[PDB]
Amino acid sequence: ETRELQSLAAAVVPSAQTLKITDFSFSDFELSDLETALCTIRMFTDLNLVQNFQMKHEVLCRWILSVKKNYRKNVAYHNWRHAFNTAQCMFAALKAGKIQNKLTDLEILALLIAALSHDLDHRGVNNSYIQRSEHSIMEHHHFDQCLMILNSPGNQILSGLSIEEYKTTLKIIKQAILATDLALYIKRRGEFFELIRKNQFNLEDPHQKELFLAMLMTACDLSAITKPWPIQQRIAELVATEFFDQKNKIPSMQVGFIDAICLQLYEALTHVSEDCFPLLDGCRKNRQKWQALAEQQ
Ligand SMILES: CCCOc1ccc(S(=O)(=O)N2CCN(C)CC2)cc1-c1nc(CC)c(Cl)c(=O)[nH]1
Ligand SMILES: [Mg+2]
Ligand SMILES: [Mg+2]
Ligand SMILES: [Mg+2]
Numbered sequence: 681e682t683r684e685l686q687s688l689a690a691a692v693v694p695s696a697q698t699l700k701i702t703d704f705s706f707s708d709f710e711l712s713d714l715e716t717a718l719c720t721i722r723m724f725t726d727l728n729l730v731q732n733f734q735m736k737h738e739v740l741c742r743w744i745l746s747v748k749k750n751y752r753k754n755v756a757y758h759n760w761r762h763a764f765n766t767a768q769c770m771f772a773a774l775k776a777g778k779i780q781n782k783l784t785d786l787e788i789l790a791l792l793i794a795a796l797s798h799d800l801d802h803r804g805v806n807n808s809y810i811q812r813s814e815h816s817i818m819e820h821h822h823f824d825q826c827l828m829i830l831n832s833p834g835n836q837i838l839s840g841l842s843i844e845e846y847k848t849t850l851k852i853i854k855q856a857i858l859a860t861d862l863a864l865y866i867k868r869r870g871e872f873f874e875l876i877r878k879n880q881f882n883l884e885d886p887h888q889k890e891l892f893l894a895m896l897m898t899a900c901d902l903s904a905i906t907k908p909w910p911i912q913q914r915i916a917e918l919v920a921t922e923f924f925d926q927k928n929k930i931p932s933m934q935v936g937f938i939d940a941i942c943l944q945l946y947e948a949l950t951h952v953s954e955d956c957f958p959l960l961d962g963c964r965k966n967r968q969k970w971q972a973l974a975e976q977q
């Protein structure tokens with residue numbers, strides 16, 4: 681054991697409501713690492729994951745500490761906090777967004793783990809340890825890092841699954857993490873948009889289900905863009921720090937990013953579940969804000 685594990689295992693886990701992890705407008709700026717750790721336990725708990733898969737408290741805690749440890753603090757945006765926020769957005773979409781009832785337990789288990797693990801060991805959009813020797817290169821590496829952790833002694837939060845359940849969950853996890861490659865999202869989204877507009881969308885079809893999960897991953901991954909203005913400015917500042925340093929051109933970049941990538945996604949997601957409207961809403965409000973700024977710059 682480490683001190684950190686000891687403290688985390690021994691701590692009381694406040695409720696979902698006390699932790700605010702059900703709010704789409706959630707922010708982690710004022711939280712310590714330990715506090716994000718507790719939030720994460722609460723997520724697995726209220727999703728019924730500890731229950732239905734018999735996770736041992738000490739194993740979950742060690743797992744989360746392992747996941748956090750394998751992000752780099754030295755990377756301004758792509759770090760544990762971003763991973764943690766992606767998972768909190770998944771949680772909020774499942775509960776407040778009422779998507780939980782559209783999915784199986786194994787899908788839910790896999791999305792949470794995928795959300796937390798999808799950028800593992802990221803070195804910043806600039807850094808180029810993609811050699812070699814020459815596709816979703818980063819995402820494959822994030823998934824390897826995830827599997828490694830899931831297989832570490834003391835960390836095996838899936839031990840309680842049968843082999844069948846386990847194989848299935850692993851495949852879903854892998855797909856979810858690969859889905860976070862924006863290049864995949866752009867190739868796949870057309871089909872998702874067609875289905876929605878032709879009123880054809882059907883989650884009971886395995887193919888369409890898998891496509892939705894992919895889209896849900898992207899939605900959560902990009903969710904900083906949906907946050908209240910003061911918070912989104914701060915995050916945008918971290919992103920900029922990573923992109924450029926590891927400035928009035930920035931407001932129009934954000935507008936372009938919102939137009940090209942974000943709006944349609946959150947519009948589609950709201951069609952699937954009207955209770956995910958808050959994401960669409962916050963994204964629009966942020967477009968106002970950035971546009972206004974761009975017109976002075
Ligand atoms: C404010 C700093 C600049 O912000 C951006 C500028 C450009 C673009 S992009 O989509 O046109 N660009 C195309 C090339 N590709 C390699 C990288 C992405 C994205 C952002 C942007 N992305 C994210 C998602 C990571 C968040 Cl969360 C964010 O806030 N801002
Ligand atoms: Mg809210
Ligand atoms: Mg701290
Ligand atoms: Mg079920």
Ligand SMILES: [Mg+2]
Nearest residue numbers: 798799860861
């Ligand atoms: Mg990524």
Ligand SMILES: [Mg+2]
Nearest residue numbers: 833834835836
């Ligand atoms: Mg063991």
Ligand SMILES: [Zn+2]
Nearest residue numbers: 798799860901
């Ligand atoms: Zn990400």
